[PDB]
Amino acid sequence: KLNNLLLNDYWVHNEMKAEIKMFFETNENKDTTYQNLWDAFKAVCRGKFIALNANQIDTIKNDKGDITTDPTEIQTTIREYYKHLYANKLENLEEMDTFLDTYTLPRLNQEEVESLNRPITGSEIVAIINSLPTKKSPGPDGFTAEFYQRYKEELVPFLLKLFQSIEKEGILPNSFYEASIILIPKPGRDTTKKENFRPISLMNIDAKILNKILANRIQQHIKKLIHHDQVGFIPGMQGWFNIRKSINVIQHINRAKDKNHMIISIDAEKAFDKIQQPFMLKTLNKLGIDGTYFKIIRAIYDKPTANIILNGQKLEAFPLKTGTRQGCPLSPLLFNIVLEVLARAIRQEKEIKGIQLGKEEVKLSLFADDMIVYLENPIVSAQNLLKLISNFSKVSGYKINVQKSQAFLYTNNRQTESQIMGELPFTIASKRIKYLGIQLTRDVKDLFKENYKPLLKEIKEETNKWPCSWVGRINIVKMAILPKVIYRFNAIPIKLPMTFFTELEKTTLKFIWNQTLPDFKLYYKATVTKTAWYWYQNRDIDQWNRTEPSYNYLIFDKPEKNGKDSLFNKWCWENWLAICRKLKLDPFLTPYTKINSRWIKDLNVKPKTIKTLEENLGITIQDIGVGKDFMSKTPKAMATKDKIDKWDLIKLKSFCTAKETTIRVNRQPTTWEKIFATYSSDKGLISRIYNELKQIYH
DNA sequence: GCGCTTTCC
RNA sequence: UUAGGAAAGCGC
Ligand SMILES: Cc1cn([C@H]2C[C@H](O)[C@@H](COP(=O)(O)OP(=O)(O)OP(=O)(O)O)O2)c(=O)[nH]c1=O
Ligand SMILES: [Cl-]
Ligand SMILES: [Mg+2]
Ligand SMILES: [Mg+2]
């Protein structure tokens, strides 16, 4: 193992910088591969550092209550358990082909495929090295990320040749197959049971650099491969999309006169560990992923092994015949791609009936391995779901974790309820289901009780178990309390009573003063109001936003007469209007009002006219021009008049040319309006809205 | 752009 | 001997 303190020494740094250069001159131009040369180099750098210098598992309990405190017996039991877990690779290759051919799967085009097979560059390697985390343990070879950062200039030309030889032969250095497994406890589980540990992998930094490059390449096309129902590990997606969608679906069932529904929360057992490698490679081929990229993935999964590090010892290696390492940057994407085969199958199987919410059919919400399935007529639909999952399990290794899976079941009588319960492997919850850190409730009326009441109590528990200045104590509230509170608001932005904030302010101020500060009321307002950004963007992926019992919620538009039983949108709207009132802003007809708006549609204008104006001139009424500027700001606008229906042109001129329209639309937009209209990304919305709310309410 | 924490898996 | 991925915030 490398001591990072040695890299700080001028004499060691110069002696090493020269030894690296002297190795690649003496040993290059020999009867050897770049793969074996790299491994020999690491072995030589290792010995040169030695010459220059010249977490406990105490008890394991079985299913019968017998324990062992013997280090050898604990090591044997643990090693035998993990060895068996990763031992059995499936051989039913024809059945894998059959399942994959059964459903319609996406496929990368030649442009996307060439982007994956694009040769690795030195600048690609450099950027990864620069972003490597510091103060972390090395992999089994002993080299920390700091070794690669310190000798970047000398190593990158060599790493590039190594990676170029890997992309030619599909052969890796032997060390690229090694990893250390560290066993970490799973929160709140019994730590005396061997199955309640999470096996975390520490791979060598050189292999992690290659894997991060491969992960970055496929992540560029992940939106094409994964349907928007999956938000776990996906860039630009939020877990609260699934939470709010699930809650509106529960409210729909609550309001339905005919109960014949089921909401199933399925967790996969040891999700990354049980992935079948031949099924994963076949799935990548099915999506068009082939060539150089595929060859490298295949080489990575050829003969990986693991050495468990337990109680001062490095245990004998075992092969990883199953799974993708927890700790490898490629693993989240390859897992999601495999699970996506099941997700496509569920959505495509009409005999697995989803919940119809008007024109929206809801059926699935995914967050990494967690699936929420929304079913109608579960006596048939849940049985077809379990059958499909069983067939996927046979080819992929997928397994339902029965102890972590639960369902809400809604029927009209006890007879159908018992008939359904008796045919399912997981339990029926009668009050709540923990999902993404929050409690989904069987009846949406219990949301405040099961989420915000426990939150106030757990914040008192954080301040009780917490030698610090009042300035440092304000930072503890900001670092640890604030994210828990914002997370809950984002998940369930329901109307909260003032009493919630009064008690939250009391618990917080007492902790700071021992019996800028975060304004929890303004963070709440920012989070609630933030939803209006999604209303304006009107994205196809935002199905969560189209699940309320409702008369559209639109900003920068003429409001409708107006639902009454809205959990989130009505409350968002009321906050939006109150903030606009405080800003002395007319928010109904503005420079950001769209051409496709109630303002234009109420003139009885044709949708073809709206489309013609959008495709030729832009998206807002301001783009087409108001007053003297009406369809005359550019030669393109003047000519576009000839493509518009004669009657609609007169209606539009009458509206756009009116004095009231001209004053409201041709004005200058405020900072507040720009936050909600001019940003194509939703990143940092709470920070930007909160910052504006401070400059208005303080 | 750098750094730090938190939520989820 | 705590890795990884996405997301959120705080901060100069
Ligand atoms: C919690 C967690 C998950 N993951 C990945 C790998 C996991 O297999 C996957 C799903 O996480 P989990 O569902 O939390 O765990 P699991 O599926 O491994 O095991 P269990 O049977 O207890 O459900 O997400 C990490 O890489 N690191 C983590 O810290
Ligand atoms: Cl027209
Ligand atoms: Mg997509
Ligand atoms: Mg799981």
Residue numbers in the entry: 251 to 304, 388 to 799, 803 to 851, 871 to 905, 912 to 923, 927 to 1062
Article sentences:
The LINE-1 (L1) retrotransposon is an ancient genetic parasite that has written around one-third of the human genome through a ‘copy and paste’ mechanism catalysed by its multifunctional enzyme, open reading frame 2 protein (ORF2p). Human L1 encodes two proteins, ORF1p and ORF2p, the latter having endonuclease (EN) and RT activities, along with three other domains with unknown functions. Two folded domains which we name ‘wrist’ (863–1061) and ‘tower’ (240–440, described below) are absent from other known structures of RT enzymes from viruses or mobile elements.
To characterize domains of ORF2p of previously unknown function, understand how these domains interact during priming and reverse transcription, and elucidate the structural basis of differential RT inhibition as a basis for rational drug design, we solved the crystal structure of ORF2p core in an active configuration, using an AlphaFold model for molecular replacement. The structure represents a ternary complex with an incoming deoxythymidine triphosphate (dTTP) nucleotide and a template–primer heteroduplex containing a three-nucleotide (nt) 5′ overhang in the RNA template and 3′ dideoxy-terminated DNA primer. The complex crystallized in space group C2, with one monomer in the asymmetric unit. The catalytic triad of aspartic acids (D600, D702, D703) resides at the active site and coordinates a Mg2+ ion and the dNTP; D702 and D703 form the base of the FADD loop (inset). The 5′ upstream RNA template enters ORF2p above the fingertips, with eight residues contacting n−3, including hydrogen bonding between the base and an extended palm loop and the tower. The DNA primer is contacted through the n+5 position, held upstream by the primer grip and downstream by the thumb with the helix clamp at its base. In the structure, the wrist makes numerous backbone contacts with the RNA template through n+4 to n+7, and trialanine mutants spanning these residues have resulted in reduced or no retrotransposition activity.
